[PDB]
From Swiss-Prot:
It catalyses: (2E,6E)-farnesyl diphosphate = (-)-vetispiradiene + diphosphate. The Asp-Asp-Xaa-Xaa-Asp/Glu (DDXXD/E) motif is important for the catalytic activity, presumably through binding to Mg(2+). CDD domains: Terpene_cyclase_plant_C1 (cd00684). It comes from Hyoscyamus muticus (Egyptian henbane). GO terms for molecular function: magnesium ion binding; vetispiradiene synthase activity. Mg(2+) 3 binds at D415, T419, E423. It is found in: Cytoplasm. Belongs to the terpene synthase family. Tpsa subfamily. Pfam families: Terpene_synth, Terpene_synth_C. This is Vetispiradiene synthase 1.
Length: 510
């Protein structure tokens, strides 16, 4: 409602100003409490109003006391929270800061097992680890053991937080989903800031109104295309397509970006349905070629049912160019278009393997299947609606940089792990787990562990690629991180349904 949103926005304006003042006057507070305020504001989801301000405070913290000496760092919780925040914001702080909580043989002190809060934040900090950080490997095994054993006697909401954290860590979760969860936690606390809490609830509800509005636009666009009238076997799933985009960015300024990303995801869906409709290779062949050539002149080459998706592909990417024209960014669209061509090529390749009954080696499989994860296309498309994403960012993306490869690898391997424990054989025999078994001459258990390891490695790659100096800005990288987060949670189905409801259906009671 127009006037409910206005009321929210008005109060938020003032609450924002009071919170900015609150961050300014954490200047003369202990480190522990500066960290707690930032952590609370960030987890309440209102940190985006204060981006540069928070980023300056953290930068200062990183530079002020680099060899975490002085007495506050004797506190596990303070060290763990600073470590996580700094690493998440791209500051390459050494896990050597945890050395003091360890004795001779690199084992964490048993005396720490009574500090549940500290253990919890130690745990969260450990999931930001990258390669060859054994201290953090040890922190993970150590905190997990003690948190699991203490949970039965913990009171709420701390008990809740611990259980939740153990199932999926903060750093590897969908930000908006965690924000809604953390708001419920903070509500339940006794010593909370009622202003920040109210600010967080109003801002969540206001953002959600925008999100419902965007979803309506996506949904009306889909209905206008009228696919289910011409392709009645096509999946009618616009909501699911739009949902992913709230995981990539929730903030108001990425509104145009979400709607654009939403539409490409829906079009991917339509291209999948078109590929799988008959599976007649001669048809897939001309479809694929027509897409590579990408021109309306090609539409007459196609079977009738394929003309439908082809014109809508073409119209969609035209609209993108027209829409960005206002900002002189029409020229970035062809980078997303290229990823769309790429995925169709790879769709064709696996279709043919399937027909030929060919089982690719792991290398051949991955060479094809990173793209069919859609994550090159989805990543690239997430920048179409961001004014701050320039030609140089798309040029970078085109090089298939490490963080993108890791993102897609994560998505591919975690999907393959999930779909093997189910469909096992038939498919598409040529699933990734089956390919590994045959290629390396190992069993299913071993093939599974290797895919699990590749996901772990993917996470470590991402966690390292976000540490400064970075090749592109934190804002650009956070879209890729967020795509990693979404796929990790999804495959930990209608696994997303309670999240759809929390994000786009149910408002928070004020």
């Amino acid at each position: 409602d127009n006037q409910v949103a206005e009321k929210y926005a008005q109060e938020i304006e003032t609450l924002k100003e009071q919170t900015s003042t609150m961050l300014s006057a954490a200047c003369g507070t202990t480190l522990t409490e500066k960290l707690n305020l930032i952590d609370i504001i960030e987890r309440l989801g209102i940190a985006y109003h204060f981006e540069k301000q928070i980023e300056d405070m953290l930068d200062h913290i990183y530079r002020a006391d680099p060899y975490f000496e002085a007495h506050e760092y004797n506190d596990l919780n303070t060290s763990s929270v600073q470590f996580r925040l700094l690493r998440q914001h791209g500051y390459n702080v050494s896990p050597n800061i945890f050395s003091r909580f360890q004795d001779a043989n690199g084992k964490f002190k048993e005396s720490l097992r009574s500090d549940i809060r500290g253990l919890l934040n130690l745990y969260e900090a450990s999931h930001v680890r990258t390669h060859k950080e054994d201290i953090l490997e040890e922190a993970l095994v150590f905190s997990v053991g003690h948190l699991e054993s203490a949970a039965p006697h913990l009171k709420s909401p701390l008990s809740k937080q611990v259980t939740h954290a153990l199932e999926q860590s903060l750093h590897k979760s969908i930000p908006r989903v965690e924000i809604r969860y953390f708001i419920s936690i903070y509500e339940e606390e006794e010593f909370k800031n009622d202003l920040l809490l109210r600010f967080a609830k109003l801002d969540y509800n206001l953002l959600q109104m925008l999100h419902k509005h965007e979803l309506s636009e996506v949904s009306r666009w889909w209905k206008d295309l009228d696919f289910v009238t011409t392709l009645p076997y096509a999946r009618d799933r616009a909501v699911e397509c739009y949902f992913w985009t709230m995981g990539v960015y929730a903030e108001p300024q990425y509104s145009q970006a979400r709607v654009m990303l939403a539409k490409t995801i829906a079009m991917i869906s339509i291209v999948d349905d078109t590929f799988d409709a008959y599976g007649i290779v001669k048809e897939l062949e001309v479809y694929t070629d027509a897409i590579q050539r990408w021109d309306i002149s090609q539409i007459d080459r196609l079977p009738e049912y394929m003309k439908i998706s082809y014109k809508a592909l073409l119209d969609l990417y035209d609209d993108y160019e027209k829409e960005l024209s206002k900002d002189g960014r029409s020229d970035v669209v062809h980078y997303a278009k290229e990823r769309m061509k790429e995925i169709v090529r790879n769709y064709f390749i696996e279709a043919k393997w399937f027909i030929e009954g060919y089982m690719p080696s792991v290398s051949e499989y991955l060479s094809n299947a990173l793209a069919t994860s859609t994550y090159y296309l989805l990543t690239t498309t997430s920048y179409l609606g961001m004014k701050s994403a320039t030609k140089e960012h798309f040029e970078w993306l085109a090089t298939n940089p490490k963080i993108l490869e890791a993102n897609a690898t994560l998505c591919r391997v975690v999907d393959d792990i999930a779909t093997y424990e189910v469909e096992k054989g038939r498919g598409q025999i040529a699933t990734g787990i089956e390919c590994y078994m045959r290629d390396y001459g190992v069993s299913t258990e071993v093939a599974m562990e290797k895919f699990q390891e590749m996901a772990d490695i993917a996470w470590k790659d991402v966690n390292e690629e976000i540490l400064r100096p970075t090749p592109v800005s934190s804002e650009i990288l956070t879209r890729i991180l967020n795509l990693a987060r979404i796929i990790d949670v999804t495959y930990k189905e209608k696994v997303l349904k309670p999240h759809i409801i929390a994000l786009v259906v149910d408002s928070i009671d004020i």
